[model samples]
Target: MDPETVRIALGLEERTAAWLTELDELGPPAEPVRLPRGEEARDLLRRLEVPELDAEEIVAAAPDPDRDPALWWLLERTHHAIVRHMGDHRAKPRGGPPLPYEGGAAARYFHVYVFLATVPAVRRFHAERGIPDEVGWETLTQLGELVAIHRRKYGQGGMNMQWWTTYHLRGILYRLGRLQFSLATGKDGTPHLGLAVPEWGGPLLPKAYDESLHRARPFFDRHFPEHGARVAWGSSWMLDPQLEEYLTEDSNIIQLARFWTLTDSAPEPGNADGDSSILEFVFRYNGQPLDELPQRSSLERAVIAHLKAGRHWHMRTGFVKLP
Candidate 1:
């Protein structure tokens, strides 16, 4: 797309394309890529709908009345982020699509959505602080610098969002005048821009960690109540033997069932292929790898019933009828 087309697409002024380069879109062909307008992706989009958006349409997407077009372009970019990506055949949970690894297929989707999703909050944040796009494309560069700094300060083992603090991630959003959703947080209270997109039976999505997300998350929590926790709820990337030490009794994190994993080729600790497991649910009290769930007869049967006996660790602290 030309600069004008891209500009219109992103709904930006003459300046704010951040140089308007290119998107890291899919590399596959027309036929295998569903030959345009995929049926399966459309189906999944429907199921994942929230209050503002359905599978086919972004209902309330234009969070910024002036920049209404900004989010539409983001949605378009994410379509490729949806299907027909580069590599890594980590299959989807419900037998949907492969979880792409190379060049970040699924990860891009979350970043784009989070940017669009938090449009209103980010605007408000800057309005309060009087921050503007004073530096033009250099705004993106500063955000990039913050990203690199986070990677250096913290290990980059998880997804992209897992690298930074809320202040740092929002620094990017503050720059873009764009940004939602949870990328998960650690016990230290620092937020992260995570790529830990393990799933229940839907599209693999990255977790989020931005102060703007905190502003936006309450809206989602209002819409989807019980599953409502902030960035701290998703720690699937953590597998430290020392993890238990940092956890309080009420510290909770989201994880897929024992047998489930992002890739059959590279199973997490005790997770294995096949043997259908539990769907997405909250573990309000605590977390552990399947191999390290507390051993007791009371937990033994529940663990077996969950089909996670030969596991590394797990999190079921507030589980019902559990010992």
Candidate 2:
């Protein structure tokens, strides 16, 4: 992105001096970082058929200061930019082609858009400097109405409102946890830097009982990360019911949401060394009321405080074993 293009993207009655001072750090390079089990995705990038990114343009044009353009850009680019170029779409059959630009590519950059579109800090940042809040409106309504249309033409319905809401809403939470403001120089010796986060997560954590949790060496080989594959990104996990296209008589999504969150392992007695969970999933509730669900461990406390450690754990008279 050239100076004029970037300025146009940002839109202005001339940005405040604080932003100008912060420009040097506004868009830094995507530093090389790795995550658990990400070696394969990285390898995929090695043989990617996509054109090299015009990273400067990608950065310079940024959060497209105006909401309308930002919405337009997200819709336009969500097609996963990898398909735009032409090349060996069938290069390494196993490694497959490069990932597209959406949830697959440039996730961090997209996440930043999510951050600006929602956080209140955005405003204080601007008030403090030139400022920040979400680069958004009442839930970014400007985009959703159009987002449905784009989904119709560009993709499918399962990738519909339910999915988008979950995607961005959850994404906002994620960015909130990470977005930071800085007024000092970045390690790269860039001056006037402001608003930053850890360039890498260092190491990530898995938060589910999934495949690998699945009985498969197949998960790593699957293209669909959600289909019981050992994908590291929980967001990409495909647990959500594809409503309009439900395979069962009908699947109501809300049911699963509660069901999944509430159900975990009930603890067992003498569950030596927590060994079952050392490598495998622990279905146990963290410290909920101890109603048993066939867990390896039992009630942690027979207490007057009775802070039941398992969901529905208390029995009126006495502890009864499941027959």
**lDDT value, residue 102 of candidate 2:** 46
lDDT of all predictions, in order shown? Answer: 0.31, 0.26
Model 2, range 1-112, lDDT digits (tens) per residue?
Answer: 3333333443422442233233323332232111112333223222221112322222333433244343333323322221121121221111011112443223223432
Error of 1 at 146 (Å): 24
Global fold similarity of model 2 (TM-score): 0.19
For model 1, the local distance difference test gives 0.31
Poorest lDDT segment (10 consecutive residues) of candidate 1: 314-323
Candidate 1, TM-score vs. the true structure? 0.22
133 Cα displacement, candidate 1 (Å): 45
- On a 0 to 100 scale, what is the lDDT of residue 84 in model 2? 23
